[PDB]
Design a protein around this ligand. Structure first.
Ligand code: U5P
Ligand code: U5P
Ligand code: ZN
Ligand code: ZN
Lengths: 294, 294
């Protein structure tokens, strides 16, 4: 068990602890549960999906990186595949408030970057902020996505965001998590190729500026992040954050990053380079390169 | 009349055009209307406050800087003083999506930076995004603020943001637009003193990192911006954006900036320096200095 899960696990119900102890054994438990694992968990406890998701939220919140607030939020995104993806909020000392990752964005990005094609529901241990409701309205699930919160009854996103602004208002038909491939040729080494592959999956219908970041860890692990625009612009997930969401959920920590690469167009209306390098230097990484698409 | 207002004005009703033509005569019309001016406008047209506010939204939207979307949004914040403040959205080529200013944030910041102590209502020509509903929930007006949208009936913010997240969740009692003065001594020249004065009005209860930016124009005009945190962190208004909101509403343009100063603490958990310089260099300003508080 990775040390982060240790207090949360200790507080779980006995039959849940038992069913989970095999799964959580590995330090690099991927903060995700396949359909099969969810079925076993249900057989061992008698919990249904929603109640299981709620019971598990302490483990998702245990992945939160909150040096400023000490307010840990956990979210579980439930893929249409049946896979459940954890997500937790992250705050970065030395950067800005605009670089913060919310638990809900972490869980959705985990699912999208893992290749999930659509989400069925999202379970969170605290009500989502307007920034997250706006982020969720970018998805191909639109206003129908169901949110599950402790003590409340389920609701579609349209109930949490009445008279919603979204891609339709800007006449955009390509929604986040729809299949996208921008056809940039992968060149360079492993890390730049991973960054370009991430840029190829970019959701960028508003500025048409593709970008992706890939981080290489001490042990050779590469974590990649694709850029995801939002119709309201500011809730956009920058490329670096995707990679850091993955690095953290998968059990690693910022001192394990060795190199990082950002791929983006040279003549692009929006440029990620400055915010990427500045946040990475804040986290300690200083080996940052940029490969540019054409 | 500043050229931006010229098409919008031409499309206004005749008795409105007549009443406004004196006010809009000056190129540097401050994109604000005092209680007296609103009274005159009502006498000249017979419009009540809400309908007047709607009639005026084309002039507020005429201040929008939208190189990416060409989607102009105008907002009118109505102060408790009776002053109405315009606001419009701004997009910055060469920066990121996180630097975007929404019309609603522009109008609220205009009011706060002008010294308005509380808002009564906000009128917008398009429904506010979740990012803005979250921004509005930081204010001392809380969930009671009334939003007015074309064709809809008025509603308090609590109707647009059900089961809201906000400062109470983080046990914060100091709300935005409450009186704040952090007591930093004003040192240096005019521009650094203006930046420190702006930092002294910072709403920063979450990171305790005060900052302010002041911009000096070719003609000697100084525009200042205070930092305003948000409970959901990301909707935070950075200091530079406050100053650029003011510079643009007041009729100036980015090539008029000569110098800029950012004031902030050296040992602060969050640092504005990198995003401030990078966005200003993108806008063309290259004379940026930083004075630091202690
Ligand atoms: O919708 C929300 C609201 C709050 N938090 C987060 O909780 C902290 C305080 O806000 C920050 O880390 C922020 O990311 C979330 O993750 N989701
Ligand atoms: O709440 C909203 C929604 C959209 N817009 C803006 O309209 C454009 C497209 O989104 C951007 O400039 C963004 O700031 C607003 O000002 N307010
Ligand atoms: Zn949120
Ligand atoms: Zn908005």
């Amino acid at each position: 068990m990775h040390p982060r899960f240790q207090t949360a696990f200790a507080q779980l119900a006995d039959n849940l602890q038992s069913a989970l102890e095999p799964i959580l054994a590995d330090k690099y438990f991927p903060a995700l549960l396949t359909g099969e694992q969810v079925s076993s968990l249900k057989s061992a406890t008698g919990l249904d999906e929603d109640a299981l998701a709620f019971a598990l939220l302490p483990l998702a919140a245990a992945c939160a990186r909150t040096p400023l607030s000490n307010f840990n939020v956990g979210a579980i995104a439930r893929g249409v595949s049946g896979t459940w993806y954890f997500g937790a909020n992250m705050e970065f000392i030395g950067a800005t408030m605009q670089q913060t990752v919310h638990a809900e964005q972490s869980a959705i990005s985990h699912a999208w970057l893992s290749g999930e094609k659509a989400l069925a529901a999202i379970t969170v241990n605290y009500t989502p902020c307007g920034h997250c409701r706006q982020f969720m309205n970018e998805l191909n699930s639109g206003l129908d996505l169901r949110i599950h919160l402790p003590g409340r009854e389920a609701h579609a996103l349209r109930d949490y965001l009445p008279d919603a602004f979204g891609p339709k208002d800007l006449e955009i038909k390509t929604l986040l998590m729809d299949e996208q491939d921008h056809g940039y040729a992968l060149t360079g080494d492993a890390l730049s190729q991973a960054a370009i592959a991430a840029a190829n999956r970019s959701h960028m219908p508003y500025s048409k500026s593709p970008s992706g970041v890939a981080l290489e860890c001490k042990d050779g692990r590469i974590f990649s992040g694709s850029y995801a625009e939002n119709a309201a612009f500011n809730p956009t997930l920058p490329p670096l954050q995707g990679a850091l969401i993955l690095l953290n959920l998968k059990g690693y920590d910022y001192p394990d990053i060795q190199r990082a690469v950002l791929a983006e167009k040279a003549d692009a209306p929006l440029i990620q380079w400055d915010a990427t390098s500045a946040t990475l230097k804040a986290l300690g990484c200083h080996s940052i390169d940029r490969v540019l698409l054409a």
